[PDB]
Amino acid sequence: MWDVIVVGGGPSGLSAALFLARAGLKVLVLDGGRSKVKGVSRVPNYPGLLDEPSGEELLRRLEAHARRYGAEVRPGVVKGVRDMGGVFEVETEEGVEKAERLLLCTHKDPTLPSLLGLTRRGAYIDTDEGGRTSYPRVYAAGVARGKVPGHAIISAGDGAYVAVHLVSDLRGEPYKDHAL
Ligand SMILES: Cc1cc2nc3c(=O)[nH]c(=O)nc-3n(C[C@H](O)[C@H](O)[C@H](O)COP(=O)(O)OP(=O)(O)OC[C@H]3O[C@@H](n4cnc5c(N)ncnc54)[C@H](O)[C@@H]3O)c2cc1C
Questions:
Q1: Potential cystine with 89: which of 82, 100, 125, 127 (Cβ 3.0-4.6 Å)?
Q2: Which CATH number do you get for residue 100?
Q3: What are the angstrom distances between the C-alpha of 19 and each of 11, 49, 109, 162?
Q4: Within a domain: residue 179?
Q5: Domain range spanning residue 53?
Q6: Domain count, the chain
Q7: 180 domain residue, yes or no
Q8: Ligand 1 atom 15: residue of nearest CA
């Protein structure tokens, strides 16, 4: 079982996983390997990354960062999602995984949003300021919820933003992941 299952392992999904894991949650990221940044030979505008790595390298570092604090990042394509009342069942080609909350960081792909009958805002998933969709316990972040035009740093920032508010809901208090 999982506290949260993040669908999509691009900047928003991996950033979300990092914050969720650091909050001590059991988080699993299922990614289909079609991040829009994967083919970039050199990302020159991710504030702070002065070596300007390729999109492929950036993804590797983001996955490492999330795994570093407990997140599990696995390749997989979600094709089914069933609400079983209290737990969501997510299905890939490899099998089924269960989570109480789902966070969609699926970029522009309307597949899963349509499966859940999520309310839309134009071509994107409709959400409140914090990323909560029209479906209870289902969240969205990054390009998936309209943070466009899409850029790596913007999606990463939103993934963390939504994750922080997801954690805040669970702890009933404004959650901050700060360090000395
Ligand atoms: C040619 C090109 C060049 C670019 N150059 C830059 C640049 O220099 N700087 C910059 O900041 N941005 C750049 N971008 C844009 C940037 O890559 C995106 O804004 C960013 O990747 C968006 O992050 P995201 O997390 O929202 O989605 P994405 O990174 O697109 O990730 C979505 C992920 O979810 C997965 N997914 C979707 N559906 C499922 C499913 N059902 N099951 C499992 N996994 C699923 C996908 O396979 C994918 O890995 C470029 C884009 C392109 C196309």
A1: 82
A2: 3.50.50.60
A3: 12, 19, 24, 10
A4: no
A5: 2-173
A6: 1
A7: no
A8: 151
